Amino acid sequence: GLADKVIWAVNAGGESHVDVHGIHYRKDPLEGRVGRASDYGMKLPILRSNPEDQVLYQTERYNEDSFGYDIPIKEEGEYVLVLKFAEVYFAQSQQKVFDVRVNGHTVVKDLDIFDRVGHSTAHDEIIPISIKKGKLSVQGEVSTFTGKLSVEFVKGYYDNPKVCALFIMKGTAD
């Protein structure tokens, strides 16, 4: 029943896709908020994922600079931001280190997918946030919540989070 608790989800790369657990990615909602499935290399399976949700975990958009998501939040609880990252471009580790921020909060400021996955597969960062009384605590970073959850990912070695299967679900990590 993941489809029930999801509040927001975006795979930067493809276009409007429902994952097999019922998780519908918002067709490229942040770059001009216009969607253009830039699959192209569907011949590079993410391995970990079944063909359709693999698309949701494989397709990438146009990396340029710090581009970020707006996840409007109006409640409190454990919001679990689990984004699936993929990278198939420049084979280098501990150099292509991306920034990953959850409402400004740099949770993964070092994201080098190639090092973490090694070969073309599905990388996942599971980021549970705890909001209480209007304050949003991510892992060990505690700050007051403001307006929405803001996932800003910043370019490291040219690329930032290349494929971005952003999935924020509500209420719990369990």
Q: At 2, which helix (H) or strand (E)?
A: helix 2-5
Measure the CA–CA gap between 128 and 121, rounded to whole angstroms: 22
Structural domains in the chain, CATH included, are 1-174 (2.60.120.430)
Measure the CA–CA gap between 16 and 28, rounded to whole angstroms: 8
The DSSP-derived string for the chain is -HHHHEEEEEEETSSSEE-TTS-EE-SS-SSTT--------TTS--SSS-HHHHHTTT------S-EEEEEE--S-EEEEEEEEEE--S---SSSS-EEEEETTEEEEEEE-HHHHHSSSS-EEEEEEEEEETTEEEETTEEEE--SEEEEEEE-SSS-SSSEEEEEEESS---
User: Could you count the other beta carbons within 10 Å of the beta carbon of residue 141?
Assistant: 15
The binding site for a carbohydrate consists of: 40, 62, 89-90, 159
C-alpha 154 chain-centroid distance:
12
Sign of CA dihedral 35, 86, 153, 129: positive
Measure the CA–CA gap between 104 and 148, rounded to whole angstroms: 10
- Type of residue numbered 72: P
The binding site consists of: 40, 62, 89-90, 159
Residues in the chain: 174
138 and 102 Cβ atoms separated by less than 8 Å: yes
